[PDB]
Amino acid sequence: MGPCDIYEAGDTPCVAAHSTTRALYSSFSGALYQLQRGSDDTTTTISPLTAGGIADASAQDTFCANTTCLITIIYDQSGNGNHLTQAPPGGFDGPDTDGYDNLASAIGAPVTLNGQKAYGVFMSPGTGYRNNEATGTATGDEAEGMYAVLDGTHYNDACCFDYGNAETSSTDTGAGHMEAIYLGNSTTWGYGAGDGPWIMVDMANNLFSGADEGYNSGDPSISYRFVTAAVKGGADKWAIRGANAASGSLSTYYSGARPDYSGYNPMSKEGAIILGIGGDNSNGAQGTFYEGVMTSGYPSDDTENSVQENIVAAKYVVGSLVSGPSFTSGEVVSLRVTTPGYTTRYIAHTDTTVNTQVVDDDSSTTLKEEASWTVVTGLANSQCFSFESVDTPGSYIRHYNFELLLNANDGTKQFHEDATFCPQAALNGEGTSLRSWSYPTRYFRHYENVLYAASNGGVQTFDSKTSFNNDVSFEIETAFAS
Ligand SMILES: *[C@@H]1O[C@H](CO)[C@@H](O[C@@H]2O[C@H](CO)[C@@H](O)[C@H](O)[C@H]2NC(C)=O)[C@H](O)[C@H]1NC(C)=O
Ligand SMILES: OC[C@@H]1O[C@@H](OC[C@@H]2O[C@@H](O)[C@H](O)[C@H]2O)[C@H](O)[C@H]1O
Ligand SMILES: OC[C@@H]1O[C@@H](OC[C@@H]2O[C@@H](O)[C@H](O)[C@H]2O)[C@H](O)[C@H]1O
């Protein structure tokens, strides 16, 4: 039995079921999600290896070979057709074309379910999926239950990383017009004990960590690499239950009556489905979606313990983020451009500007240093790396407004995440392709001799698809700074 089988057995069936990693029903064998490579814009679907099995990753790898990929659709295994597509603009606009949010990369969250490779949905700020016209999802004050397996170590405080019930107009229509899971350390509304993140319930104009608006000590900081967030709501009653999806039971952080404030009882849920964003399209949050569902009816604590147990069984385990050459901490390297007509330039810098210059043995000591980088363990992820200036120690290469700059490490989380880059076998085949970690859709890329955290096609002029593969492939060579 898969999650939704258990939910069916409990008389609280799924009305929406999403996951890019595995089937949620034992008998499901259809398409899980859809891909689309930047090479030719053509698509393809990835399904389970076998009925109710894990996703056929190799197929995604085959399809995305020597190019970039995005997840265009996360199908609803339930049959209701509540697939999740690119989120539209609402109370806020997305960073993508005409106000849309960004589709996520297909390789930003590689994992293995019981030894089998699969891909999660790594969402950077500005990314979001939605379905404003679902079927079967609770509305009005109707009871419902939901859950999700997220990455307890990927998130922020910006509004809002959700997965649940939202408004069908993509606008904030007031309190009680939402019921979605939330995971982050935002404190603009509710919040819990510790530094976070916290599993909270977005009920519109308020993320709730418990009964009282604002602070609630009953909701603890939950930060496992694989978190199971279970949330349910009914007639003047709801609850927050969390657990290490990798192992163990669900714990109850909240159980009781609706927060005692106008508009929260009875509820006024509209029935749309959102992911990685807020009900009015707030898109400043980040997270990782592995699998999750919504249901009709208030699930019994028992029913949920079964789902959790099944999850633990799925055996989630972080997957390799690196491919290609790769480096070793403490290694001093020099990165050479492979694009035809620029093959004698190296990634260097002029103060905080990271660019490409012509460096050779006649070059000054200063430039050989500005063109030499010390590779240290990824500031935000030990699997990957961060690049430190040889000439300017204490500073690393980080993206800002998507421009590679040379700033000093200020010890913060932001800096850490903006300075982490993961090695991938060069798209053109020559060397490595340095993929951002916090923005898996972006790679080190030179555009008119200046470095950017560019995507294969986008809203920035430097996101150009023209010469992309070459502009993101670099050869690792001996550091000029010896
Ligand atoms: C959410 O958690 C992060 C990480 O602990 C907090 O970030 C720090 O941010 C402040 C405000 O900029 C800096 O003084 C600290 O130096 C940062 N520390 C780290 C470790 O990054 C963030 O403030 C938290 N958000 C809220 C709303 O409380
Ligand atoms: O690389 C992208 C990103 O740029 C920096 O933030 C800019 C910030 O984001 C919006 O709220 C506003 O446009 C601006 O204040 C981050 O350092 C980096 O991750
Ligand atoms: O970074 C070097 C180079 O810049 C970008 O293209 C520049 C383009 O080429 C000629 O047609 C003109 O000089 C200019 O519009 C590429 O992305 C990159 O390889």
Side-chain angles (χ1 to χ4, degrees):
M1 291 189 289
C4 291
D5 291 313
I6 301 171
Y7 273 124
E8 202 280 314
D11 281 309
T12 51
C14 290
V15 294
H18 313 94
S19 181
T20 51
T21 65
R22 65 158 183 166
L24 299 176
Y25 294 87
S26 56
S27 58
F28 185 78
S29 61
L32 291 167
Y33 55 100
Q34 183 189 62
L35 305 171
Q36 177 182 54
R37 57 196 186 186
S39 54
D40 48 25
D41 284 359
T42 62
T43 72
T44 192
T45 85
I46 302 298
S47 300
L49 294 175
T50 181
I54 311 306
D56 192 326
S58 56
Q60 177 188 304
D61 295 334
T62 288
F63 184 63
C64 309
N66 291 73
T67 193
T68 48
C69 267
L70 297 177
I71 293 184
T72 54
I73 303 177
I74 301 182
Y75 298 123
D76 165 27
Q77 302 165 27
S78 110
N80 279 165
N82 300 315
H83 316 304
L84 296 179
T85 45
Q86 180 147 43
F92 293 99
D93 279 319
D96 227 294
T97 312
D98 301 297
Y100 279 82
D101 299 311
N102 299 320
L103 291 164
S105 168
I107 58 168
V111 294
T112 59
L113 278 68
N114 195 60
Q116 301 173 64
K117 185 175 176 176
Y119 292 100
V121 190
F122 196 95
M123 307 171 68
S124 58
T127 305
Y129 293 89
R130 183 168 206 148
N131 186 308
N132 291 306
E133 41 163 61
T135 285
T137 49
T139 50
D141 190 48
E142 303 177 327
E144 77 187 312
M146 55 200 81
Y147 89 83
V149 183
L150 316 163
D151 180 334
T153 66
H154 183 207
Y155 65 89
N156 54 20
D157 43 31
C159 182
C160 274
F161 192 75
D162 290 0
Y163 174 65
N165 213 298
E167 309 94 310
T168 59
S169 70
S170 292
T171 60
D172 174 4
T173 52
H177 278 262
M178 288 191 73
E179 196 164 71
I181 291 173
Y182 172 91
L183 185 61
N185 73 303
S186 152
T187 67
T188 291
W189 298 279
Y191 74 96
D195 302 320
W198 309 289
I199 303 172
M200 298 193 286
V201 183
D202 194 337
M203 284 189 211
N205 288 350
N206 256 146
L207 292 175
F208 279 107
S209 54
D212 291 325
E213 224 163 53
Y215 182 70
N216 289 292
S217 64
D219 200 21
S221 286
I222 188 160
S223 58
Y224 301 122
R225 182 55 186 68
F226 291 112
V227 176
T228 292
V231 167
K232 55 195 168 186
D236 194 31
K237 91 178 67 56
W238 57 294
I240 297 180
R241 297 182 81 201
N244 173 341
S247 161
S249 59
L250 286 168
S251 303
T252 290
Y253 306 147
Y254 185 75
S255 181
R258 290 290 173 180
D260 185 41
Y261 301 93
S262 302
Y264 292 110
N265 188 55
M267 289 296 273
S268 307
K269 314 156 177 181
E270 288 173 25
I273 307 180
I274 56 173
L275 171 62
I277 57 168
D280 68 339
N281 202 54
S282 285
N283 48 295
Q286 50 170 51
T288 298
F289 184 68
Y290 289 108
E291 64 169 70
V293 311
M294 285 183 82
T295 76
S296 170
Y298 197 86
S300 63
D301 278 26
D302 290 325
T303 292
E304 291 174 314
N305 299 338
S306 298
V307 180
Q308 168 54 194
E309 186 181 59
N310 168 289
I311 291 185
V312 178
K315 295 184 185 180
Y316 273 94
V317 159
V318 172
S320 197
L321 281 157
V322 189
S323 82
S326 195
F327 317 81
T328 300
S329 188
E331 160 180 25
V332 197
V333 302
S334 262
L335 307 167
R336 190 175 65 65
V337 169
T338 59
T339 301
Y342 298 97
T343 43
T344 71
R345 302 177 84 83
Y346 293 71
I347 292 180
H349 72 77
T350 304
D351 302 316
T352 56
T353 308
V354 182
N355 47 52
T356 58
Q357 296 178 42
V358 170
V359 188
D360 56 49
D361 297 306
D362 291 296
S363 301
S364 67
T365 37
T366 288
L367 182 59
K368 295 197 180 195
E369 270 167 34
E370 303 176 297
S372 291
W373 308 93
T374 313
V375 185
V376 308
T377 305
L379 286 171
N381 186 283
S382 68
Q383 282 201 57
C384 310
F385 308 97
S386 289
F387 300 77
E388 169 164 46
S389 167
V390 162
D391 67 293
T392 307
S395 306
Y396 303 74
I397 292 185
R398 62 89 70 75
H399 62 78
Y400 192 83
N401 268 306
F402 304 130
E403 275 200 73
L404 294 190
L405 308 185
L406 178 68
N407 298 331
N409 169 25
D410 61 34
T412 70
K413 181 181 168 193
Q414 194 63 56
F415 192 94
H416 286 180
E417 307 191 319
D418 293 334
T420 310
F421 295 95
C422 308
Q424 195 188 319
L427 298 192
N428 75 6
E430 296 168 54
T432 177
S433 287
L434 305 172
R435 188 176 71 270
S436 178
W437 171 87
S438 58
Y439 282 72
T441 58
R442 298 169 173 284
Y443 297 84
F444 260 50
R445 189 276 179 65
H446 66 91
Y447 178 76
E448 297 187 303
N449 309 324
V450 175
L451 271 293
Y452 298 100
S455 73
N456 191 9
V459 312
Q460 281 86 43
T461 54
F462 51 77
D463 287 309
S464 180
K465 291 188 151 197
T466 299
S467 202
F468 189 78
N469 277 29
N470 288 328
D471 299 332
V472 298
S473 300
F474 305 80
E475 288 281 16
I476 306 176
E477 304 181 318
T478 305
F480 281 112
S482 191

